[PDB]
Amino acid sequence: IXFFEMQACWSHSGVCRDKSERNCKPMAWTYCENRNQKCCEY
């Protein structure tokens, strides 16, 4: 139900940075709670 079977950005070990960042490494199998923030590794 939705798109895929991703996990929580805080459930594993990630962070939510600004989508307009220049130094953000987007990680899969996980998403952010905000609709304007991406779940990056660090």
Side-chain angles (χ1 to χ4, degrees):
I1 311 95
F3 295 114
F4 224 63
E5 274 95 72
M6 274 170 228
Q7 292 113 38
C9 202
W10 16 286
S11 182
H12 265 14
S13 266
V15 192
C16 285
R17 321 222 113 199
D18 275 25
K19 54 105 198 141
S20 236
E21 222 240 289
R22 259 239 281 198
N23 216 305
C24 209
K25 295 175 148 289
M27 265 182 105
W29 332 115
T30 180
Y31 50 66
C32 190
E33 185 141 301
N34 212 243
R35 242 229 72 161
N36 208 233
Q37 234 165 5
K38 346 198 264 152
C39 180
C40 268
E41 191 271 277
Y42 217 88

